[PDB]
Amino acid sequence: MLKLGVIGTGAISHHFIEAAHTSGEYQLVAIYSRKLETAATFASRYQNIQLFDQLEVFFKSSFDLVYIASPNSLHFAQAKAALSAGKHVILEKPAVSQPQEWFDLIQTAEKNNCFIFEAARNYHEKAFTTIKNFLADKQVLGADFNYAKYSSKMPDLLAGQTPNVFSDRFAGGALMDLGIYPLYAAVRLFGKANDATYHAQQLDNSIDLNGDGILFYPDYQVHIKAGKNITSNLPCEIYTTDGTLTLNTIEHIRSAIFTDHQGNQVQLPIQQAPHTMTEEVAAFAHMIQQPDLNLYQTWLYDAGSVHELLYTMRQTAGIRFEAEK
Amino acid sequence: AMLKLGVIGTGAISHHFIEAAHTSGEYQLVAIYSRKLETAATFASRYQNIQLFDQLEVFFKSSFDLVYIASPNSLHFAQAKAALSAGKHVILEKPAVSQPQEWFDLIQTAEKNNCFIFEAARNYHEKAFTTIKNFLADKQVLGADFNYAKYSSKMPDLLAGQTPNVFSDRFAGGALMDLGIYPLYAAVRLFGKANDATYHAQQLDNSIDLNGDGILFYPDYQVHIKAGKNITSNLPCEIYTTDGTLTLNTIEHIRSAIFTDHQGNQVQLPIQQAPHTMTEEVAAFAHMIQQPDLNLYQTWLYDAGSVHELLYTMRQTAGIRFEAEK
Numbered sequence A: 001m002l003k004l005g006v007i008g009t010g011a012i013s014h015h016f017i018e019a020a021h022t023s024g025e026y027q028l029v030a031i032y033s034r035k036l037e038t039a040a041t042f043a044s045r046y047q048n049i050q051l052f053d054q055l056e057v058f059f060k061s062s063f064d065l066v067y068i069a070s071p072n073s074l075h076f077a078q079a080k081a082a083l084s085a086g087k088h089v090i091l092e093k094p095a096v097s098q099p100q101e102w103f104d105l106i107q108t109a110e111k112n113n114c115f116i117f118e119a120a121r122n123y124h125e126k127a128f129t130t131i132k133n134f135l136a137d138k139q140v141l142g143a144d145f146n147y148a149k150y151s152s153k154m155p156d157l158l159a160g161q162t163p164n165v166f167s168d169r170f171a172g173g174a175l176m177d178l179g180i181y182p183l184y185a186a187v188r189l190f191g192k193a194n195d196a197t198y199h200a201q202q203l204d205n206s207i208d209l210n211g212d213g214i215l216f217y218p219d220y221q222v223h224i225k226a227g228k229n230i231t232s233n234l235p236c237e238i239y240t241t242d243g244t245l246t247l248n249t250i251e252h253i254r255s256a257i258f259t260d261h262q263g264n265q266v267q268l269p270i271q272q273a274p275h276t277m278t279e280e281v282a283a284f285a286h287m288i289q290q291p292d293l294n295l296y297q298t299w300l301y302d303a304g305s306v307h308e309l310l311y312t313m314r315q316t317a318g319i320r321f322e323a324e325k
Numbered sequence B: 001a002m003l004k005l006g007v008i009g010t011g012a013i014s015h016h017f018i019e020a021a022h023t024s025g026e027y028q029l030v031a032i033y034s035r036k037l038e039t040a041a042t043f044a045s046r047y048q049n050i051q052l053f054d055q056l057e058v059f060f061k062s063s064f065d066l067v068y069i070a071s072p073n074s075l076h077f078a079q080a081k082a083a084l085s086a087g088k089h090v091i092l093e094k095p096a097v098s099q100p101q102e103w104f105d106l107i108q109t110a111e112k113n114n115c116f117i118f119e120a121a122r123n124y125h126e127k128a129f130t131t132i133k134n135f136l137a138d139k140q141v142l143g144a145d146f147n148y149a150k151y152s153s154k155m156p157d158l159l160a161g162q163t164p165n166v167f168s169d170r171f172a173g174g175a176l177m178d179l180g181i182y183p184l185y186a187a188v189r190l191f192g193k194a195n196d197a198t199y200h201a202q203q204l205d206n207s208i209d210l211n212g213d214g215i216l217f218y219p220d221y222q223v224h225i226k227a228g229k230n231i232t233s234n235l236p237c238e239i240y241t242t243d244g245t246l247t248l249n250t251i252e253h254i255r256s257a258i259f260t261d262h263q264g265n266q267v268q269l270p271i272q273q274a275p276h277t278m279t280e281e282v283a284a285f286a287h288m289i290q291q292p293d294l295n296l297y298q299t300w301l302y303d304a305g306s307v308h309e310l311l312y313t314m315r316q317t318a319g320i321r322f323e324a325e326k
């Protein structure tokens, strides 16, 4: 039974803990916050939880694993300290702001004999295994993936504030916050791309409100759309020589249907999970309990591929964070 | 009084045009040109009392008011120029030309011979676009996503090692030129000319694009464009505004247009899809000739120029080069 520490008192932390408890494989025991009162307010719905407003003291406590859902810009430093203190780390997406940070995390992890995982919830969905198997004997000719929805932080932005998710100080933007999902889907299904491009509508601080990119593969390309000031409801498509696979989304996928060039249809057996994080939560605890180091190596590798793509795409669009300026 | 119609091109598309022309009550087919008189004969046989021709010079000397031209893309320019110099009005199938200077050249020739020239951009003329543009008139647009990608009937020939005209660098083929022009025309119709454009394609050895993705850049937003001929997409087309998303089932022969706001309220736009894809353009062209609104005609010419400029810019970024350009 895994002892769970948590950083970040956002709603997402509640969602993770709720999935972790439900799996029957974790037990929350500790919470860190910048303020004790915020930790208390967060923890009040739970029972017997140690509270911390000092990261140093937090990491010296007895737990096995820490879920980190702080702002993007803080992920690296907090995760590195967690690993140095011999804790396993589940790190919310996007795990890092630069590919080198990911490689440094891995080294730090190996040194301290701990697992580091990016909480790429869509990547672990059983749907993707079903979809990849289906395409195994097919020849892919292209794809079109998106994730664009109108942020709850839009009113604050429009009123002249700069919410963390739209700030260059906190490594935000549509590509970082949402575009990472279709990138993870592409890597899951197609592996590492050859190259990538991205162009975005940007705020004055260079952060992207929305954008369009392409991932380049040997005999095809994948259009990527990300957006936070717009709502898209476009399905996601994968083209093959014999037809088109239509996925309703590339996250928390609920249907996958193949149509051939004569209009004959095949419904892939998709069984959406009750919650968005159910499958990653099971996968992570399964890995720590019964290590498949080969599977672990691919998770690390695919995360590396995603963050290389993100970084290339930010560079082409001119999306620059404060520490890069 | 009926417009006497001559036709170049004996493909299925010419039969479809003629059918719409006759159904409108505004045209009467009188002449058909073909490279071979026998090809003209087979094509003409379903009609009545049609003159057949196998020489363009002789064709253009006969009595008809206007010519519909549906030859391969690379032949559009020279044939249309000859028609206009012969004093015939021209409906030229899309894509009208291979480079914007050709379009300007046709317009100059048309004006000096006091004739109309129309690009047969069937979607641009759909009443749906008037309804959509009126609805967007007091919204603030934040971007759009348009596509036209359908698996070509010429794919089996292609895959068998042949090279159909639509996939040939000698006939100005490719997904962008053949299908991509529809979303471009839709974008120009609603938003006007973009400030810049890019396109990246999957290409045959002759540089012709099987499919591709591009972006039209406007001052405060961008429009994703997808075109394809070796793939089939059924993605809807979206226009984003500050207050919601307008969803069109397509940007050609549009059937439905629904606006959904950020609170989930829906507004259905009144779209009345024509019985046929060409109904609306055929009525518009006849109406322009018989009861001209010349200012509107000029807008049609300008917008076509905008479309072909974007097309040409996009071919250049993707490296799509025709035989004449190599």
Ligand SMILES: NC(=O)c1ccc[n+]([C@@H]2O[C@H](COP(=O)([O-])OP(=O)(O)OC[C@H]3O[C@@H](n4cnc5c(N)ncnc54)[C@H](OP(=O)(O)O)[C@@H]3O)[C@@H](O)[C@H]2O)c1
Residues within 6 Å of the ligand: A008, A009, A010, A011, A012, A032, A033, A034, A035, A038, A039, A069, A070, A071, A072, A074, A092, A093, A094, A119, A121, A164, A165, A177, A276
């Ligand atoms: N997998 C998913 O479906 C999912 C959904 C949402 C987001 N995520 C990710 O989870 C992470 C957090 O999301 P979020 O929207 O909750 O971010 P956030 O609200 O900006 O920050 C999250 C937590 O970090 C702390 N924090 C806020 N501002 C800070 C600052 N200036 N300096 C240090 N700490 C600060 C706060 O906790 P304290 O007040 O207790 O210090 C806050 O509760 C992001 O990386 C995001 O990408 C994943």
Ligand SMILES: NC(=O)c1ccc[n+]([C@@H]2O[C@H](COP(=O)([O-])OP(=O)(O)OC[C@H]3O[C@@H](n4cnc5c(N)ncnc54)[C@H](OP(=O)(O)O)[C@@H]3O)[C@@H](O)[C@H]2O)c1
Residues within 6 Å of the ligand: B009, B010, B011, B012, B013, B033, B034, B035, B036, B039, B040, B070, B071, B072, B073, B075, B093, B094, B095, B120, B122, B165, B166, B178, B277
């Ligand atoms: N608006 C629409 O919805 C619609 C749909 C389809 C096509 N179009 C357009 O219509 C035009 C033709 O399409 P298509 O598929 O029918 O093209 P196509 O088959 O390649 O050629 C059409 C006609 O042009 C002639 N032709 C063929 N090869 C030729 C050559 N090497 N040299 C000179 N003439 C040749 C043939 O007529 P002859 O044998 O009698 O000479 C043929 O019937 C294209 O510009 C296309 O973009 C638009």
